[PDB]
Amino acid sequence: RVAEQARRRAIARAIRQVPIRDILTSPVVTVREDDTLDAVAKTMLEHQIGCAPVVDQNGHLVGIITESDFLRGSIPFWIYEASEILSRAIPAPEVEHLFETGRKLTASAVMTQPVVTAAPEDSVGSIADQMRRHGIHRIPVVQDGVPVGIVTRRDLLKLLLLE
Amino acid sequence: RVAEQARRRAIARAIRQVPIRDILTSPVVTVREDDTLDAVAKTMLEHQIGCAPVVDQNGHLVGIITESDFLRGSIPFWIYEASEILSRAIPAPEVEHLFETGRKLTASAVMTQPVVTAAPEDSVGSIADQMRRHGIHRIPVVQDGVPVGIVTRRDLLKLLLLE
Ligand SMILES: [Cl-]
Ligand SMILES: [Cl-]
Ligand SMILES: [Cl-]
Numbered sequence: 001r002v003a004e005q006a007r008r009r010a011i012a013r014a015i016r017q018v019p020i021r022d023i024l025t026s027p028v029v030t031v032r033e034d035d036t037l038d039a040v041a042k043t044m045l046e047h048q049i050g051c052a053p054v055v056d057q058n059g060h061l062v063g064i065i066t067e068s069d070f071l072r073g074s075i076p077f078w079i080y081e082a083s084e085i086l087s088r089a090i091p092a093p094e095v096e097h098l099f100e101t102g103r104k105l106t107a108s109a110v111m112t113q114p115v116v117t118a119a120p121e122d123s124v125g126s127i128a129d130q131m132r133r134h135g136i137h138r139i140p141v142v143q144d145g146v147p148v149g150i151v152t153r154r155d156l157l158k159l160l161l162l163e
Numbered sequence: 164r165v166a167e168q169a170r171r172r173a174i175a176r177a178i179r180q181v182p183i184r185d186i187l188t189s190p191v192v193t194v195r196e197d198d199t200l201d202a203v204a205k206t207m208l209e210h211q212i213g214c215a216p217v218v219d220q221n222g223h224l225v226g227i228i229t230e231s232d233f234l235r236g237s238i239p240f241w242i243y244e245a246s247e248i249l250s251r252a253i254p255a256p257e258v259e260h261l262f263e264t265g266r267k268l269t270a271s272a273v274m275t276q277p278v279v280t281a282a283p284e285d286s287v288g289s290i291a292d293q294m295r296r297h298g299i300h301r302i303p304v305v306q307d308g309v310p311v312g313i314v315t316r317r318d319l320l321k322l323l324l325l326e
Contacts, residue, residue, distance in 0.1 A: 007257070008237050011237075011239075011253060011257060011261070014252045014253050015239060015249075015252065017252065018248075018249075018252050023241075025244075025245065025248075050317065066320075068317075068321075071323070071324050074171050074174075076178060076322045077320075077321040078186075081188075081321070085186075085188075086178075086181075088185070089178065090174060090177045090178075094173070097170070098174075154213065154230070157230060157234070158230050158239060158240040158241040159239045159240075159241050160234070161234050
């Protein structure tokens with residue numbers, strides 16, 4: 001019983017010392033702050049992702065955008081996935097109005113500012129601590145100014161408990 | 164300005180009246196309460212899902228299991244995705260011990276009980292209300308005792324704000 005605990009303790013400590021870059025196993029997909037929401041939705045759906053770093057024209061991080069952010073512009077992100085299903089609920093000219101609005105607004109209009117960022121050489125444990133300390137759900141990873149990923153609470157729960 | 168608000172109001176109202184069964188657009192994948200965690204991991208990774216209803220031998224819902232639940236048995240789910248990366252952190256006999264444990268524990272040993280369930284004829288608004296009121300992140304949809312889906316907070320945020 002005691003030895004089992006020592007065993008568990010050592011695994012947990014090892015896991016906290018894993019560098020962030022080791023858990024960034026997907027390619028980073030970003031969007032431009034000037035991309036229209038229509039283009040962002042296409043990009044997200046085409047790569048099967050629900051959030052993305054927003055960068056300026058020269059590739060520097062300026063914000064984060066998620067599906068839920070579309071509601072800040074009064075657009076439900078689902079319109080890009082299932083307009084036919086939603087057209088059963090909402091009349092056609094109103095659906096078209098949502099699309100027209102998505103073609104006008106940009107990522108910059110609804111993105112958020114990240115409260116904290118991490119570097120690829122930071123440890124899993126240090127990022128977990130950030131996550132719990134600010135009670136947030138996503139943290140962008142930046143290497144030399146350039147986004148190289150977003151770490152989510154779901155990613156970390158594959159490795160360790162979060163308080 | 165006033166006219167736009169009426170427009171947005173009617174859209175928001177329409178969205179709350181969409182029946183749940185309209186948003187269950189993916190096929191339900193379940194696991195058995197007696198499946199080993201090794202098999203559960205395999206199922207979830209084959210189907211690219213992070214949670215699943217747990218059913219009994221005759222198919223009735225008995226629980227919910229997610230990747231994070233593996234930690235309840237002291238196994239990091241990531242071991243099933245990236246054991247080679249984890250082995251740079253953890254000696255090989257210890258990783259093997261994790262695998263051994265996963266082949267012994269079953270879904271029933273780590274699954275959770277759902278505080279609330281929904282029926283497919285219920286509305287989006289009503290399940291959204293359930294989410295916030297119980298402050299939960301996932302709700303199983305059941306049609307005649309049989310799971311037909313799991314609705315998450317992420318799903319709902321494609322449609323409407325929560326609290
Ligand atoms: Cl609008
Ligand atoms: Cl998350
Ligand atoms: Cl163990």
